[PDB]
Amino acid sequence: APDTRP
Amino acid sequence: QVQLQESGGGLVQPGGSMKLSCVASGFTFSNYWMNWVRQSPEKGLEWVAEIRLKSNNYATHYAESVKGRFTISRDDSKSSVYLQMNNLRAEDTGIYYCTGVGQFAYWGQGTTVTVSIVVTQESALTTSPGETVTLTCRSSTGAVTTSNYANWVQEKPDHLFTGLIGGTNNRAPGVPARFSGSLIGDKAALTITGAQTEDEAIYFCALWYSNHWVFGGGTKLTVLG
């Protein structure tokens, strides 16, 4: 996945 | 608010070098990956490079078009991301943006550099205020799925980019509720439930393919009446 940080 | 301020663009000869800078404020810069994306009349929006966190050893990845010539780096102590560009070519001409967060919420104003898989969207759609309009985003590899982390980004005049949706269905902070993202059939979709006059703009989708992004060609949305 890419950057999934909210 | 969040600001991403770019600098460093200008005129450069083929074979030359240039370094772009982007300073971030208003969010915890060091917690997020950062990207460079460029825009040209010819090639549209093109993802150039990403840099991950300190806990990822600052891992990077590049578009094939720039690999071996461009270097992305970051200085978390200065909340800054950079792009070193070497061995410049005519095709590198364009407006360069730093962008990130969930996954393209925030965009800088752009800095202009002058050197001197297909994602398909509707070329245009026409709607009217109060209508429901759905923009779509197709992959040339097969279905768009959650694995493609579709993002939707709005371009308003003066090359003003704002991320609306990320991660398929996630509305970026403070984005109007009339915008929603989903998967419909084998495509990603942006739905505007009650279009507003000010929504007349170009909307780009971006899809993730394991380790890089590909942007669609954009949809020009006209909002008539």
PDB file of C-alpha atoms in Angstrom:
ATOM      1  CA  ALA A   1       0.000   0.000   0.000  1.00  0.00           C
ATOM      2  CA  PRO A   2       0.933   3.647  -0.289  1.00  0.00           C
ATOM      3  CA  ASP A   3       0.855   6.049   2.697  1.00  0.00           C
ATOM      4  CA  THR A   4      -2.328   5.007   4.528  1.00  0.00           C
ATOM      5  CA  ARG A   5      -1.721   7.155   7.611  1.00  0.00           C
ATOM      6  CA  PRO A   6      -4.905   9.157   8.225  1.00  0.00           C
TER       7      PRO A   6
ATOM      8  CA  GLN B   1      -4.084  25.649   7.716  1.00  0.00           C
ATOM      9  CA  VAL B   2      -1.539  23.589   5.822  1.00  0.00           C
ATOM     10  CA  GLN B   3       0.982  25.226   3.565  1.00  0.00           C
ATOM     11  CA  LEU B   4       3.496  23.700   1.205  1.00  0.00           C
ATOM     12  CA  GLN B   5       5.767  26.396  -0.175  1.00  0.00           C
ATOM     13  CA  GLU B   6       7.946  25.565  -3.163  1.00  0.00           C
ATOM     14  CA  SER B   7      10.982  27.284  -4.568  1.00  0.00           C
ATOM     15  CA  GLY B   8      13.861  26.604  -6.951  1.00  0.00           C
ATOM     16  CA  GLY B   9      12.332  26.584 -10.443  1.00  0.00           C
ATOM     17  CA  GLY B  10      13.663  28.536 -13.394  1.00  0.00           C
ATOM     18  CA  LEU B  11      15.206  28.294 -16.837  1.00  0.00           C
ATOM     19  CA  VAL B  12      17.959  25.723 -17.361  1.00  0.00           C
ATOM     20  CA  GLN B  13      19.798  24.321 -20.386  1.00  0.00           C
ATOM     21  CA  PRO B  14      19.523  20.692 -21.479  1.00  0.00           C
ATOM     22  CA  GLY B  15      22.122  18.672 -19.534  1.00  0.00           C
ATOM     23  CA  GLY B  16      21.795  21.052 -16.601  1.00  0.00           C
ATOM     24  CA  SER B  17      20.865  20.600 -12.976  1.00  0.00           C
ATOM     25  CA  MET B  18      18.405  22.231 -10.599  1.00  0.00           C
ATOM     26  CA  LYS B  19      17.268  21.724  -7.019  1.00  0.00           C
ATOM     27  CA  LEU B  20      13.685  22.279  -5.898  1.00  0.00           C
ATOM     28  CA  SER B  21      12.651  22.839  -2.290  1.00  0.00           C
ATOM     29  CA  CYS B  22       9.338  22.554  -0.471  1.00  0.00           C
ATOM     30  CA  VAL B  23       8.768  23.674   3.133  1.00  0.00           C
ATOM     31  CA  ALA B  24       5.690  22.341   4.963  1.00  0.00           C
ATOM     32  CA  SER B  25       3.718  23.814   7.881  1.00  0.00           C
ATOM     33  CA  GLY B  26       0.460  23.038   9.662  1.00  0.00           C
ATOM     34  CA  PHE B  27       0.812  19.234   9.904  1.00  0.00           C
ATOM     35  CA  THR B  28       3.276  16.695  11.335  1.00  0.00           C
ATOM     36  CA  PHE B  29       5.404  16.559   8.175  1.00  0.00           C
ATOM     37  CA  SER B  30       7.677  13.777   9.481  1.00  0.00           C
ATOM     38  CA  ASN B  31       4.739  11.335   9.863  1.00  0.00           C
ATOM     39  CA  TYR B  32       3.842  11.320   6.155  1.00  0.00           C
ATOM     40  CA  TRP B  33       5.395  10.228   2.883  1.00  0.00           C
ATOM     41  CA  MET B  34       6.015  13.040   0.389  1.00  0.00           C
ATOM     42  CA  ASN B  35       5.822  13.116  -3.406  1.00  0.00           C
ATOM     43  CA  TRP B  36       6.764  15.246  -6.333  1.00  0.00           C
ATOM     44  CA  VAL B  37       4.297  15.418  -9.233  1.00  0.00           C
ATOM     45  CA  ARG B  38       4.782  17.510 -12.370  1.00  0.00           C
ATOM     46  CA  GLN B  39       2.398  19.019 -14.905  1.00  0.00           C
ATOM     47  CA  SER B  40       3.005  19.734 -18.582  1.00  0.00           C
ATOM     48  CA  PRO B  41       0.544  20.566 -21.419  1.00  0.00           C
ATOM     49  CA  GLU B  42       1.887  17.514 -23.257  1.00  0.00           C
ATOM     50  CA  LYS B  43       2.073  14.787 -20.620  1.00  0.00           C
ATOM     51  CA  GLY B  44      -0.601  16.010 -18.126  1.00  0.00           C
ATOM     52  CA  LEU B  45       0.011  15.157 -14.422  1.00  0.00           C
ATOM     53  CA  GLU B  46       2.922  12.852 -13.863  1.00  0.00           C
ATOM     54  CA  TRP B  47       4.013  11.374 -10.527  1.00  0.00           C
ATOM     55  CA  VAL B  48       7.852  11.764 -10.316  1.00  0.00           C
ATOM     56  CA  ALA B  49       9.005  10.449  -6.940  1.00  0.00           C
ATOM     57  CA  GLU B  50       8.082   9.494  -3.385  1.00  0.00           C
ATOM     58  CA  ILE B  51       9.990   9.432  -0.114  1.00  0.00           C
ATOM     59  CA  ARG B  52       8.888   7.476   2.921  1.00  0.00           C
ATOM     60  CA  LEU B  53       9.615   7.932   6.656  1.00  0.00           C
ATOM     61  CA  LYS B  54      12.761   7.859   8.886  1.00  0.00           C
ATOM     62  CA  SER B  55      11.398   4.394  10.182  1.00  0.00           C
ATOM     63  CA  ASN B  56      11.504   3.235   6.522  1.00  0.00           C
ATOM     64  CA  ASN B  57      15.134   4.362   6.180  1.00  0.00           C
ATOM     65  CA  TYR B  58      13.784   7.212   4.004  1.00  0.00           C
ATOM     66  CA  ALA B  59      13.065   4.723   1.203  1.00  0.00           C
ATOM     67  CA  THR B  60      12.468   6.260  -2.211  1.00  0.00           C
ATOM     68  CA  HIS B  61      10.896   5.315  -5.525  1.00  0.00           C
ATOM     69  CA  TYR B  62      10.922   7.087  -8.906  1.00  0.00           C
ATOM     70  CA  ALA B  63       9.058   7.240 -12.185  1.00  0.00           C
ATOM     71  CA  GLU B  64      10.998   5.350 -14.859  1.00  0.00           C
ATOM     72  CA  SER B  65      11.292   8.651 -16.801  1.00  0.00           C
ATOM     73  CA  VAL B  66      13.500  10.203 -14.103  1.00  0.00           C
ATOM     74  CA  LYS B  67      15.175   7.201 -12.420  1.00  0.00           C
ATOM     75  CA  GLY B  68      18.968   7.665 -12.204  1.00  0.00           C
ATOM     76  CA  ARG B  69      18.703  11.430 -12.809  1.00  0.00           C
ATOM     77  CA  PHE B  70      16.428  12.787 -10.023  1.00  0.00           C
ATOM     78  CA  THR B  71      16.868  12.386  -6.270  1.00  0.00           C
ATOM     79  CA  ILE B  72      14.120  13.083  -3.747  1.00  0.00           C
ATOM     80  CA  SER B  73      15.209  13.761  -0.142  1.00  0.00           C
ATOM     81  CA  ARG B  74      13.774  15.184   3.063  1.00  0.00           C
ATOM     82  CA  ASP B  75      14.892  17.051   6.163  1.00  0.00           C
ATOM     83  CA  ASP B  76      12.333  16.433   8.849  1.00  0.00           C
ATOM     84  CA  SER B  77      14.105  18.924  11.175  1.00  0.00           C
ATOM     85  CA  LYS B  78      13.258  21.654   8.612  1.00  0.00           C
ATOM     86  CA  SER B  79       9.869  20.130   7.550  1.00  0.00           C
ATOM     87  CA  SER B  80      11.233  20.153   4.012  1.00  0.00           C
ATOM     88  CA  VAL B  81      11.290  17.912   0.965  1.00  0.00           C
ATOM     89  CA  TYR B  82      13.636  18.423  -1.985  1.00  0.00           C
ATOM     90  CA  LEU B  83      14.109  17.302  -5.559  1.00  0.00           C
ATOM     91  CA  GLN B  84      17.610  17.291  -7.061  1.00  0.00           C
ATOM     92  CA  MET B  85      17.314  17.146 -10.854  1.00  0.00           C
ATOM     93  CA  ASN B  86      20.375  16.179 -12.980  1.00  0.00           C
ATOM     94  CA  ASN B  87      21.130  15.632 -16.823  1.00  0.00           C
ATOM     95  CA  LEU B  88      17.785  17.700 -17.470  1.00  0.00           C
ATOM     96  CA  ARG B  89      15.969  17.093 -20.755  1.00  0.00           C
ATOM     97  CA  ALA B  90      13.363  19.075 -22.667  1.00  0.00           C
ATOM     98  CA  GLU B  91      10.723  16.526 -21.558  1.00  0.00           C
ATOM     99  CA  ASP B  92      11.392  17.500 -17.897  1.00  0.00           C
ATOM    100  CA  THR B  93       9.883  20.926 -18.520  1.00  0.00           C
ATOM    101  CA  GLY B  94       6.780  21.511 -16.362  1.00  0.00           C
ATOM    102  CA  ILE B  95       5.268  22.815 -13.129  1.00  0.00           C
ATOM    103  CA  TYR B  96       6.537  20.768 -10.173  1.00  0.00           C
ATOM    104  CA  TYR B  97       4.395  20.236  -7.077  1.00  0.00           C
ATOM    105  CA  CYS B  98       5.187  18.693  -3.727  1.00  0.00           C
ATOM    106  CA  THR B  99       2.163  16.812  -2.421  1.00  0.00           C
ATOM    107  CA  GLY B 100       1.141  14.254   0.161  1.00  0.00           C
ATOM    108  CA  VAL B 101      -1.144  13.087   2.961  1.00  0.00           C
ATOM    109  CA  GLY B 102      -3.869  10.450   2.516  1.00  0.00           C
ATOM    110  CA  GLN B 103      -2.530  10.398  -0.277  1.00  0.00           C
ATOM    111  CA  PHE B 104      -2.619  13.750  -2.181  1.00  0.00           C
ATOM    112  CA  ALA B 105      -4.569  15.998   0.255  1.00  0.00           C
ATOM    113  CA  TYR B 106      -2.102  18.849   0.171  1.00  0.00           C
ATOM    114  CA  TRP B 107      -0.370  20.445  -2.780  1.00  0.00           C
ATOM    115  CA  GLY B 108       2.133  23.247  -3.024  1.00  0.00           C
ATOM    116  CA  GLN B 109       1.598  26.199  -5.366  1.00  0.00           C
ATOM    117  CA  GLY B 110       4.055  24.742  -7.868  1.00  0.00           C
ATOM    118  CA  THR B 111       7.417  25.923  -9.194  1.00  0.00           C
ATOM    119  CA  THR B 112       8.117  26.016 -12.916  1.00  0.00           C
ATOM    120  CA  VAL B 113      11.098  24.264 -14.485  1.00  0.00           C
ATOM    121  CA  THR B 114      11.859  25.214 -18.112  1.00  0.00           C
ATOM    122  CA  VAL B 115      14.508  23.102 -19.838  1.00  0.00           C
ATOM    123  CA  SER B 116      15.468  24.897 -23.048  1.00  0.00           C
ATOM    124  CA  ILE B 117      -0.274   1.877 -17.804  1.00  0.00           C
ATOM    125  CA  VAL B 118      -3.086   4.222 -18.790  1.00  0.00           C
ATOM    126  CA  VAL B 119      -5.650   5.626 -16.374  1.00  0.00           C
ATOM    127  CA  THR B 120      -8.719   6.756 -18.313  1.00  0.00           C
ATOM    128  CA  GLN B 121     -11.251   9.375 -17.278  1.00  0.00           C
ATOM    129  CA  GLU B 122     -14.093  11.062 -19.120  1.00  0.00           C
ATOM    130  CA  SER B 123     -12.641  13.957 -21.148  1.00  0.00           C
ATOM    131  CA  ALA B 124     -15.603  16.160 -20.204  1.00  0.00           C
ATOM    132  CA  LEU B 125     -18.877  15.985 -18.359  1.00  0.00           C
ATOM    133  CA  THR B 126     -21.577  18.644 -18.201  1.00  0.00           C
ATOM    134  CA  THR B 127     -23.939  19.034 -15.264  1.00  0.00           C
ATOM    135  CA  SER B 128     -26.035  21.753 -13.608  1.00  0.00           C
ATOM    136  CA  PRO B 129     -26.312  22.999 -10.034  1.00  0.00           C
ATOM    137  CA  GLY B 130     -28.133  20.555  -7.819  1.00  0.00           C
ATOM    138  CA  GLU B 131     -27.587  17.523 -10.022  1.00  0.00           C
ATOM    139  CA  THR B 132     -25.761  14.382  -9.067  1.00  0.00           C
ATOM    140  CA  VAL B 133     -22.732  13.757 -11.285  1.00  0.00           C
ATOM    141  CA  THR B 134     -20.377  10.769 -11.199  1.00  0.00           C
ATOM    142  CA  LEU B 135     -16.832  10.947 -12.621  1.00  0.00           C
ATOM    143  CA  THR B 136     -15.047   7.657 -13.234  1.00  0.00           C
ATOM    144  CA  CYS B 137     -11.539   6.331 -13.374  1.00  0.00           C
ATOM    145  CA  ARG B 138     -10.526   3.220 -15.335  1.00  0.00           C
ATOM    146  CA  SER B 139      -7.335   1.140 -15.259  1.00  0.00           C
ATOM    147  CA  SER B 140      -5.765  -0.315 -18.392  1.00  0.00           C
ATOM    148  CA  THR B 141      -4.579  -3.331 -16.340  1.00  0.00           C
ATOM    149  CA  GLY B 142      -8.212  -4.529 -15.329  1.00  0.00           C
ATOM    150  CA  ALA B 143     -10.511  -3.610 -12.418  1.00  0.00           C
ATOM    151  CA  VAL B 144      -9.817  -0.725 -10.124  1.00  0.00           C
ATOM    152  CA  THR B 145      -9.916  -2.110  -6.613  1.00  0.00           C
ATOM    153  CA  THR B 146      -9.092  -0.912  -3.097  1.00  0.00           C
ATOM    154  CA  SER B 147      -5.519  -2.050  -3.862  1.00  0.00           C
ATOM    155  CA  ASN B 148      -5.277   0.961  -6.213  1.00  0.00           C
ATOM    156  CA  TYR B 149      -6.022   3.474  -3.431  1.00  0.00           C
ATOM    157  CA  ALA B 150      -7.816   5.809  -5.820  1.00  0.00           C
ATOM    158  CA  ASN B 151      -7.368   9.526  -5.147  1.00  0.00           C
ATOM    159  CA  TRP B 152      -9.327  12.384  -6.605  1.00  0.00           C
ATOM    160  CA  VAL B 153      -7.717  15.803  -6.958  1.00  0.00           C
ATOM    161  CA  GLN B 154      -9.344  19.037  -8.134  1.00  0.00           C
ATOM    162  CA  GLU B 155      -7.577  21.615 -10.283  1.00  0.00           C
ATOM    163  CA  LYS B 156      -8.977  25.123 -10.263  1.00  0.00           C
ATOM    164  CA  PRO B 157      -7.603  28.062 -12.323  1.00  0.00           C
ATOM    165  CA  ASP B 158      -4.084  29.283 -11.641  1.00  0.00           C
ATOM    166  CA  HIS B 159      -3.067  25.586 -11.320  1.00  0.00           C
ATOM    167  CA  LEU B 160      -4.565  25.322  -7.813  1.00  0.00           C
ATOM    168  CA  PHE B 161      -4.676  21.668  -6.736  1.00  0.00           C
ATOM    169  CA  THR B 162      -6.677  20.295  -3.816  1.00  0.00           C
ATOM    170  CA  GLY B 163      -7.005  16.662  -2.809  1.00  0.00           C
ATOM    171  CA  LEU B 164     -10.642  15.691  -2.327  1.00  0.00           C
ATOM    172  CA  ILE B 165     -10.679  11.923  -1.828  1.00  0.00           C
ATOM    173  CA  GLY B 166      -7.998   9.417  -0.966  1.00  0.00           C
ATOM    174  CA  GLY B 167      -7.822   5.699  -0.290  1.00  0.00           C
ATOM    175  CA  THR B 168     -10.836   5.105  -2.558  1.00  0.00           C
ATOM    176  CA  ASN B 169     -13.491   6.517  -0.251  1.00  0.00           C
ATOM    177  CA  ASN B 170     -11.831   8.849   2.291  1.00  0.00           C
ATOM    178  CA  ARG B 171     -12.777  12.511   2.228  1.00  0.00           C
ATOM    179  CA  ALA B 172      -9.626  14.734   2.928  1.00  0.00           C
ATOM    180  CA  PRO B 173      -9.977  17.012   6.058  1.00  0.00           C
ATOM    181  CA  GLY B 174     -12.485  19.892   5.551  1.00  0.00           C
ATOM    182  CA  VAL B 175     -13.639  18.710   2.113  1.00  0.00           C
ATOM    183  CA  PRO B 176     -17.319  19.442   1.411  1.00  0.00           C
ATOM    184  CA  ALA B 177     -19.712  16.568   2.121  1.00  0.00           C
ATOM    185  CA  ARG B 178     -21.180  16.645  -1.406  1.00  0.00           C
ATOM    186  CA  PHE B 179     -17.969  14.892  -2.573  1.00  0.00           C
ATOM    187  CA  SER B 180     -17.735  11.148  -2.142  1.00  0.00           C
ATOM    188  CA  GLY B 181     -15.504   8.414  -3.466  1.00  0.00           C
ATOM    189  CA  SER B 182     -16.376   4.812  -4.228  1.00  0.00           C
ATOM    190  CA  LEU B 183     -15.878   1.832  -6.494  1.00  0.00           C
ATOM    191  CA  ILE B 184     -18.650   1.367  -9.023  1.00  0.00           C
ATOM    192  CA  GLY B 185     -18.355  -1.750 -11.130  1.00  0.00           C
ATOM    193  CA  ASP B 186     -14.751  -2.084 -12.256  1.00  0.00           C
ATOM    194  CA  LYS B 187     -13.916   1.634 -11.837  1.00  0.00           C
ATOM    195  CA  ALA B 188     -13.233   4.192  -9.142  1.00  0.00           C
ATOM    196  CA  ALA B 189     -15.829   6.973  -8.978  1.00  0.00           C
ATOM    197  CA  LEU B 190     -16.142  10.492  -7.629  1.00  0.00           C
ATOM    198  CA  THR B 191     -19.764  11.431  -6.994  1.00  0.00           C
ATOM    199  CA  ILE B 192     -20.862  15.021  -6.407  1.00  0.00           C
ATOM    200  CA  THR B 193     -24.320  14.861  -4.823  1.00  0.00           C
ATOM    201  CA  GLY B 194     -25.653  18.330  -5.617  1.00  0.00           C
ATOM    202  CA  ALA B 195     -23.140  19.946  -7.915  1.00  0.00           C
ATOM    203  CA  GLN B 196     -22.357  23.590  -7.206  1.00  0.00           C
ATOM    204  CA  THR B 197     -21.297  26.267  -9.707  1.00  0.00           C
ATOM    205  CA  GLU B 198     -17.848  26.541  -8.108  1.00  0.00           C
ATOM    206  CA  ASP B 199     -17.280  22.830  -8.771  1.00  0.00           C
ATOM    207  CA  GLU B 200     -16.549  23.655 -12.410  1.00  0.00           C
ATOM    208  CA  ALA B 201     -12.936  22.482 -12.537  1.00  0.00           C
ATOM    209  CA  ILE B 202     -10.698  19.700 -13.831  1.00  0.00           C
ATOM    210  CA  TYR B 203     -10.704  16.543 -11.716  1.00  0.00           C
ATOM    211  CA  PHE B 204      -7.799  14.088 -11.843  1.00  0.00           C
ATOM    212  CA  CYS B 205      -7.769  10.576 -10.452  1.00  0.00           C
ATOM    213  CA  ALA B 206      -4.608   8.792  -9.348  1.00  0.00           C
ATOM    214  CA  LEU B 207      -4.184   5.041  -9.028  1.00  0.00           C
ATOM    215  CA  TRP B 208      -1.490   3.120  -7.167  1.00  0.00           C
ATOM    216  CA  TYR B 209       0.253   0.156  -8.785  1.00  0.00           C
ATOM    217  CA  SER B 210       2.362  -1.578  -6.073  1.00  0.00           C
ATOM    218  CA  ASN B 211       5.101   1.039  -5.895  1.00  0.00           C
ATOM    219  CA  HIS B 212       4.132   4.027  -8.069  1.00  0.00           C
ATOM    220  CA  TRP B 213       1.210   6.250  -9.064  1.00  0.00           C
ATOM    221  CA  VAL B 214      -0.385   6.873 -12.450  1.00  0.00           C
ATOM    222  CA  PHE B 215      -2.684   9.896 -12.970  1.00  0.00           C
ATOM    223  CA  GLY B 216      -5.609   9.905 -15.315  1.00  0.00           C
ATOM    224  CA  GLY B 217      -5.944  12.546 -18.029  1.00  0.00           C
ATOM    225  CA  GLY B 218      -8.455  14.593 -16.056  1.00  0.00           C
ATOM    226  CA  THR B 219     -12.135  15.346 -16.547  1.00  0.00           C
ATOM    227  CA  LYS B 220     -13.230  18.866 -17.388  1.00  0.00           C
ATOM    228  CA  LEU B 221     -16.483  19.306 -15.432  1.00  0.00           C
ATOM    229  CA  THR B 222     -18.737  22.078 -16.662  1.00  0.00           C
ATOM    230  CA  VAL B 223     -21.487  23.230 -14.304  1.00  0.00           C
ATOM    231  CA  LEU B 224     -24.065  25.040 -16.559  1.00  0.00           C
ATOM    232  CA  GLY B 225     -26.901  27.185 -15.255  1.00  0.00           C
TER     233      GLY B 225
END
